[PDB]
Design a protein around this ligand. Structure first.
Ligand SMILES: CCc1c[nH]c2ncnc(NN3C(=O)CC[C@H]3c3ccccc3)c12
Length: 167
């Protein structure tokens, strides 16, 4: 038993809710919150901008030190950093940005990072301002992640259709 409440069970291990990941994280304080990062960990907008703002920019300060030491992530890759006031850890995961010509097949590689963590709170990767189809992304998530993932989808009408049309 865990503390996530109000989710719809899509499969044995994937759950979904219409919620803001920032508010879910503050309420639950999960072991792992996933950020929809870019390779530079520049958390300017989208989920990343919202998460970083909720940390009072501490996520960005930590991220800039990480990049100065290690260089950029790979598209499809990830790193584990602090969760600050939102979670124990933040798993920064880079899905492909199709608006940059990046291979959408890399979305599966991105979701594979979730399997290194038994339980996660996460957004749909590559959705929103990353430009991919959120229905597709949900399919890749379900077909790739084997650990327990709680998906927060902030957009109401997108959420409404995802669960009503999920096979
Ligand atoms: C962005 C606003 C927002 C605040 N808190 C959130 N919590 C969860 N998901 C969110 N957005 N997203 C969707 O509804 C579907 C795709 C996803 C998204 C990811 C990355 C960038 C933009 C959008 C949000």
């Amino acid at each position: 038993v865990n503390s996530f409440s109000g989710y719809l069970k899509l499969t044995d291990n994937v759950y979904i809710k219409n919620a803001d990941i920032v508010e879910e994280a503050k309420k639950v304080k999960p072991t792992v919150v996933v950020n929809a990062a870019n390779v530079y960990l520049k958390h300017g907008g989208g989920v990343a901008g919202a998460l970083n703002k909720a940390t009072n920019n501490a996520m960005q300060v930590e991220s800039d030190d990480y990049i100065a030491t290690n260089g950029p992530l790979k598209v499809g890759g990830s790193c584990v950093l602090s969760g600050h006031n939102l979670a124990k850890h933040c798993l920064h995961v880079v899905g492909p940005n199709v608006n940059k010509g990046e291979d959408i097949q890399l979305l599966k590689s991105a979701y594979e990072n979730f399997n290194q963590h038994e339980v996660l709170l996460a957004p749909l990767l590559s959705a929103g301002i990353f430009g991919a189809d959120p229905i597709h992304s949900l399919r890749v998530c379900v077909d790739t992640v084997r650990t327990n993932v709680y998906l927060a989808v902030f957009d109401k009408n997108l959420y409404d259709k995802l669960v009503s049309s999920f096979l």
